[PDB]
Amino acid sequence: TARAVRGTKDLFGKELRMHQRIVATARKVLEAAGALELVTPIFEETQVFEKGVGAKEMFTFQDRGGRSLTLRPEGTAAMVRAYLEHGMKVWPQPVRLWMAGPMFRAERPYRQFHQVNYEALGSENPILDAEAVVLLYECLKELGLRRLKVKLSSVGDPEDRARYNAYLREVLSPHREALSEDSKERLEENPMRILDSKSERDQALLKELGVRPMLDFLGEEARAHLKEVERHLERLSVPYELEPALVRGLDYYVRTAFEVHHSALGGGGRYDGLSELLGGPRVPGVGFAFGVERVALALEAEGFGLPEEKGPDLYLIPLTEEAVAEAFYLAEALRPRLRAEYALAPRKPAKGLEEALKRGAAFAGFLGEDELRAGEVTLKRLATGEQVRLSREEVPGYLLQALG
Amino acid sequence: TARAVRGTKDLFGKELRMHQRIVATARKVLEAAGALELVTPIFEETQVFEKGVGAKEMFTFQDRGGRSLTLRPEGTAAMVRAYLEHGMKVWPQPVRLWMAGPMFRAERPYRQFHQVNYEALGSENPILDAEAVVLLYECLKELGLRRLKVKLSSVGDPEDRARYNAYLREVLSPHREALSEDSKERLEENPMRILDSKSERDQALLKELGVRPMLDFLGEEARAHLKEVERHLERLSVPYELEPALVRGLDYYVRTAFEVHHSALGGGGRYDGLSELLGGPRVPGVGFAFGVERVALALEAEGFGLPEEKGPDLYLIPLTEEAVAEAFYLAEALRPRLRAEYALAPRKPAKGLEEALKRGAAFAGFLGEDELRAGEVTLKRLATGEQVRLSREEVPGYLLQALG
């Protein structure tokens, strides 16, 4: 009766294998660049994920005690919270961390998706921004994806963001009634957030007015930092395109911002004020995240198929009812060094052999009255048809010599 | 400021590696026995986890829409729910499944723990019960644990459980006031549940009365099934002990029940009526679960230590400020086939070499004005002290020939 809640789903067979490949690939590239693997809890205190003061899409609840708890909606805040909790500030900087795991989004019935996160905390050095970009680019390239579009941009320093917001107030105020609910309130609290709302009505006005990009407002230091990042990518042969449409409305996002399109598979940027937001000292940061499901779809779109599940090394066919137990005893004697399976009911040799072929077994085994009395087994290498009769003590060795 | 909620914790370094080893080991033994890996969602409809009608320890909440949702507290019901949803009843039976993942328990501030689950659904054959036991025993043995105590027992068939409950009413009724709240109510709804309550007051009365074990109430079929299971373990050289104290109060638990002690690392048994409880047809089942943290503690108790984290293949030391970027370009050219790291600031050769030793690098690399002008690099195999000067084009090949 009960089914998996909408927005969630079981992962098994090929879908699971695709997810595991994707994560295994990120693990290889990220750990080769020094990132340390970190796994945070599924839920945390709600305040860990609050973005600041400024007036539904997060699973929140309180446990026995009244404490507000929230299901992890993103990875960055949780990782920064971990860097703080474990005093990673004492480690050699920067501290590179990565993580793969489920995230929770509360939309109307993906509500549970998986993403890989990479975070370099502790330094403002532009080399780290270029590295974050290249690392994301690489994870995706290593997966076999091609036609990857890298989009780069900057959101400047907070003093630069202050001027832009003023400008936004001047340009968007005389068009107030064109916005709506929240966007009208954002004009007084955080104008830049209006550029990040997915309100078709708000997106419409913006498209018509065509206001100036945050790029045109980069301060002195911000422009030099972006130029450094650009220089590194050029030097690393990473094709990119400056994107004035790339924006980050939250007050803790600074300088570098980037995305990789195929539509966006992942992206990220620098976020220097998030640590203080959580109660910690100043901790410069830059990193990215990409959705595992988004990537699996991109691979699927490019035609990437996955080979068939490997079969057991041995599939035992009991011929009599008494042999069923003996098949189990033999298979157990061969595990786990070898993958050995067995049928639970007797059947004709031909039908059993037929089942071994379908299951892709390397060898088929037969146990009947004759082999039981002799304490032996009959083996048949399916691929070559070669059939041999050997004692039970010799099966492990024989199979190992053959499957070497 | 904000810390991981009590009962939860970040996993990194050795602790994480220990968890990954444990799961990797279960994966090897369980998949060698034919189990298919399955990953269910973190949360599901509350009804998936309700055990039946009979009057706090589960994180429950409703999403936008009023639907009651619950954080996964166990693995079995979720797996059975998956077997049903995907029509696994059509697959060749039995269907063997396994899963590893977080579970949630709502105690007063582990509230988030991890466990490995194994489930064989679709058959009543006693061979499967013995296999579940041996498989659990094996997972633990392969981890290096010794002094593993296997305890076996049975809870009989529902008709057997009915008689026992009557008996329990007769023996425990005249002692009503000795029980408490729930236990008093259980006498009328499900007496056997009183044997499963962790109420020190209830455990006391039980210890004094010393009522008869559910074992003394096994019906004809139930006694024969248990004898079959025992026969298989004997034949598999698995040392076990019959435990009359092992009980399963819920109405869907049937026959086989078992545990492995070291205090219990894991356990399980047959549960034939759970499927119907969820709205599906009759689906016989048997399996087990063990806590990853329980196992890591057991390993720790036996002294099992984990080797040190491997170091990068190459740690680049820039000698000048301009070389910092060049160190990054070189490391990126070597990744991800090789693990290459670099320092972000210049430093003396000796200090840099000093850092490479501490980080356990196979090779140390040096980039200064001289190598930059020559488009070369200086490498030093730390273990042998051998130092060589080669061009950048030759570094990948040289390192690969040396780290082969």
Retrieve residue A132's tokens.
């974050």
Q: What is the CB-side half-sphere exposure of residue B205 using CA atoms within 13 A?
A: 20
The arrangement of strands across the sheet holding A387-391 comes to: A340-342, A314-318, A363-367, A376-381, A387-391
Q: What is the CB-side half-sphere exposure of residue A313 using CA atoms within 13 A?
A: 20
CB A330 within 8 A of CB A306: no
- Can you state the angle between helices A321-334 and B220-235, rounded to 10 degrees? 40
d(CA A325, CA B230): 13
Which ranges constitute the DSSP H helices of A236-310? Answer: 274-277, 292-301
**Nearest CB to B59; choose among A9, A11, A63:** A63
DSSP B6-44: TT---B-HHHHHHHHHHHHHHHHHHHHTTPEE-B--SEE
**Three-class SS state of A247:** coil
The residue of chain A nearest to residue B329, with distances taken between CA atoms, is A236
**Three-class SS state of A250:** coil
Nearest of A390, A384, A394, A392 to residue A363 by alpha carbon: A384
**B142–A41 C-beta distance less than 8 A:** no
The residue of chain A nearest to residue B5, with distances taken between CA atoms, is A44
SS3 string, A160-219, reads HHHHHHHHHHHHHHHHHHHCCHHHHHHHHHCHHHHHHCCCHHHHHHHHHHCCCCHHHHCC
Contacts of A325 in chain B (CB under 8 A): 127, 232, 235
Retrieve residue A284's tokens.
């410069």
CB A269 within 8 A of CB A256: yes
CB A253 within 8 A of CB A270: yes
Q: Which whole-number Å values give the CA distances from A325 to A192, A334, B92, B332, B345, in the listed order? A: 71, 15, 18, 56, 67
Contact residues for B38 (Cβ-Cβ < 8 A; gap 6+): A10, A11, A12, A16, B79, B82, B97, B98, B99
Q: Which whole-number Å values give the CA distances from B403 to B100, B309, B332, B364, B379, in the listed order? A: 35, 17, 18, 13, 13
Contact residues for B20 (Cβ-Cβ < 8 A; gap 6+): none
**Nearest CB to A44; choose among B1, B5, B47:** B5
Q: Find which of B63, B103, B105, B227 to mutate to test the A interface (most A CBs within 10 Å of its CB).
A: B63
State the smallest CA–CA distance between residue B43 and chain A in angstroms: 8
The residue of chain A nearest to residue B339, with distances taken between CA atoms, is A32
Q: Which residues are bridge partners to B283 per DSSP?
A: none
Nearest of A89, A281, A35 to residue B12 by alpha carbon: A35
CB B127 within 8 A of CB B93: no
* Breaks in chain A (C–N > 2.5 Å) following residue: 55, 109, 262
Contacts of A16 in chain B (CB under 8 A): 37-39
Residue A172, phi then psi, degrees to nearest 5: -95, -15
Q: Find which of A40, A47, A63 to mutate to test the B interface (most B CBs within 10 Å of its CB).
A: A63
**Three-class SS state of A374:** helix
Retrieve residue B222's tokens.
């139930």
**A4–B40 C-beta distance less than 8 A:** yes
State the smallest CA–CA distance between residue B155 and chain A in angstroms: 24
The arrangement of strands across the sheet holding B363-367 comes to: B340-342, B314-318, B363-367, B376-381, B387-391
CB atoms within 10 A of CB B250: 17
CB atoms within 10 A of CB A381: 16
Contact residues for B201 (Cβ-Cβ < 8 A; gap 6+): B178, B179, B180
CB B2 within 8 A of CB A279: yes
Contact residues for B270 (Cβ-Cβ < 8 A; gap 6+): B129, B253, B254, B255, B256, B257, B284, B285, B286
Contact residues for B362 (Cβ-Cβ < 8 A; gap 6+): B311, B312, B313, B314, B381, B382, B383, B402, B403
The residue of chain B nearest to residue A331, with distances taken between CA atoms, is B33
CB A332 within 8 A of CB B133: no
CATH among 3.40.50.970, 2.30.30.360, 1.10.510.10, 3.30.930.10 for A1-306: 3.30.930.10
The residue of chain B nearest to residue A124, with distances taken between CA atoms, is B344
**Nearest CB to A36; choose among B12, B71, B142:** B12
Contacts of B312 in chain A (CB under 8 A): 32, 34
Q: Which residue is it, tokens 């498989």?
A: B135
Retrieve residue A20's tokens.
């595991």
Pairing of strands B340-342, B314-318: parallel
Q: Which residues are bridge partners to B6 per DSSP?
A: none
Q: Which whole-number Å values give the CA distances from B35 to A14, A20, A331, A340, B73, in the listed order? A: 15, 17, 14, 11, 22
CB B287 within 8 A of CB B277: no
DSSP B121-159: ES---HHHHHHHHHHHHHHHHHTT--SPEEEEEE---HH
d(CA A62, CA B280): 33
Q: Which residue is it, tokens 């087994």?
A: A377
Element (H, E) at A366: strand A363-367
CB B361 within 8 A of CB B317: no
The residue of chain A nearest to residue B47, with distances taken between CA atoms, is A2
Element (H, E) at B71: strand B68-71
Nearest of A132, A136, A131, A164 to residue A244 by alpha carbon: A164
Nearest of B94, B90, B95 to residue B38 by alpha carbon: B95
Q: Which residues are bridge partners to A278 per DSSP?
A: none
Contact residues for A238 (Cβ-Cβ < 8 A; gap 6+): A133, A134, A137, A150
Nearest of A273, A294, A269, A275 to residue A131 by alpha carbon: A269
Q: What is the CB-side half-sphere exposure of residue B54 using CA atoms within 13 A?
A: 18
Element (H, E) at A101: strand A95-104
End-to-end CA distance of chain A: 47
CB B218 within 8 A of CB B247: no
The residue of chain B nearest to residue A325, with distances taken between CA atoms, is B127
CB atoms within 10 A of CB A161: 22
B307-401 belongs to which CATH class? Answer: alpha beta
Q: Find which of B43, B86, B97 to mutate to test the A interface (most A CBs within 10 Å of its CB).
A: B43
State the smallest CA–CA distance between residue A244 and chain B in angstroms: 27
Nearest of A312, A322, A332 to residue A392 by alpha carbon: A332
Contacts of A123 in chain B (CB under 8 A): 344
**Three-class SS state of A83:** helix
Residue B231, phi then psi, degrees to nearest 5: -60, -45
Resolution of this model in Å is 2.4
Q: Which residues are bridge partners to A180 per DSSP?
A: none
Element (H, E) at B298: helix B292-301
- The letter for the amino acid at A241 is E
**Nearest CB to A64; choose among B29, B32, B56:** B56
Nearest of A284, A314, A272 to residue A403 by alpha carbon: A314
CB atoms within 10 A of CB A66: 6
CB atoms within 10 A of CB A81: 27
d(CA B323, CA B305): 40
The arrangement of strands across the sheet holding B95-104 comes to: B36-37, B95-104, B112-121, B285-291, B264-270, B254-261, B149-154, B240-242
d(CA B290, CA B136): 8
Nearest of A118, A265, A248 to residue A257 by alpha carbon: A248
d(CA B300, CA B298): 5
d(CA A163, CA A112): 38
**Nearest CB to A41; choose among B108, B112, B134:** B112
Torsion, Cα of A346, A347, A350, A356 (10° steps): -60
d(CA A92, CA A120): 12
**A61–B61 C-beta distance less than 8 A:** yes
Element (H, E) at B387: strand B387-391
d(CA B305, CA B308): 9
d(CA B104, CA B110): 8
Nearest of B331, B335, B336 to residue B364 by alpha carbon: B331
Residue A305, phi then psi, degrees to nearest 5: -105, 165
CB B172 within 8 A of CB B138: no
Torsion, Cα of B258, B38, A353, A400 (10° steps): -80
Tell me the residue length of chain B: 404
Largest Cα–Cα separation, chain B? 96
End-to-end CA distance of chain B: 47
Q: Which residues are bridge partners to B267 per DSSP?
A: B259, B289
CB atoms within 10 A of CB B18: 22
- Can you state the angle between helices A321-334 and B126-142, rounded to 10 degrees? 10
Retrieve residue A249's tokens.
């409305």
Residue A288, phi then psi, degrees to nearest 5: -160, 175
Classify B11 in phi/psi space as left (phi over 0), alpha (psi -120 to 50) or beta.
beta
**Nearest CB to A339; choose among B32, B127, B232:** B32
d(CA B360, CA B349): 17
Classify B24 in phi/psi space as left (phi over 0), alpha (psi -120 to 50) or beta.
alpha
- The letter for the amino acid at A63 is D
Which ranges constitute the DSSP H helices of B95-252? Answer: 126-142, 158-172, 181-189, 200-209, 220-235
**B42–A102 C-beta distance less than 8 A:** yes
Q: Which residues are bridge partners to B11 per DSSP?
A: A39
d(CA A266, CA A116): 9
d(CA B318, CA B381): 17
**B64–A336 C-beta distance less than 8 A:** no
Q: Which whole-number Å values give the CA distances from A101 to A114, A267, A283, B15, in the listed order? A: 5, 17, 24, 17
Q: Which residues are bridge partners to A258 per DSSP?
A: A152, A268
**Nearest CB to A236; choose among B128, B279, B329:** B329
- Can you state the angle between helices B126-142 and B13-32, rounded to 10 degrees? 150
Q: Which residue is it, tokens 């002690």?
A: B261
**Nearest CB to A39; choose among B10, B33, B48:** B10
The domain segmentation of chain A, as residue ranges, is 1-306, 307-401
Nearest of B139, B167, B125 to residue B256 by alpha carbon: B125
Quick one: CA dihedral B49, B52, B58, B59, positive or negative? Answer: positive
Burial B38-75 (b: 16+ CB within 10 A, else e): bbbbbbbbbebbeeeeeeeeebebebeeeeebbbbbbb
Which one-letter DSSP state was computed for residue A21? H
Burial A225-248 (b: 16+ CB within 10 A, else e): bbebbbebbeebebebeebeebbb
d(CA B358, CA B84): 54
Q: Find which of B8, B9, B12, B70 to mutate to test the A interface (most A CBs within 10 Å of its CB).
A: B12
Q: Which residue is it, tokens 């000067």?
A: B389
Element (H, E) at A159: helix A158-172
**Nearest CB to A329; choose among B16, B235, B312:** B235
Residue B258, phi then psi, degrees to nearest 5: -160, 160
CB atoms within 10 A of CB A313: 20
* Breaks in chain B (C–N > 2.5 Å) following residue: 55, 109, 262
Classify A389 in phi/psi space as left (phi over 0), alpha (psi -120 to 50) or beta.
beta
**A33–B341 C-beta distance less than 8 A:** yes
Which one-letter DSSP state was computed for residue B193? G
Retrieve residue B89's tokens.
């009843």
Element (H, E) at A220: helix A220-235
Residue B402, phi then psi, degrees to nearest 5: -85, -30
Pairing of strands B254-261, B149-154: antiparallel
Which one-letter DSSP state was computed for residue A111? -
**B11–A38 C-beta distance less than 8 A:** yes
CB A5 within 8 A of CB B62: no
Contacts of A93 in chain B (CB under 8 A): 344
Which one-letter DSSP state was computed for residue A319? S
State the smallest CA–CA distance between residue B74 and chain A in angstroms: 15
Which ranges constitute the DSSP H helices of A247-291? Answer: 274-277
d(CA B93, CA B281): 15
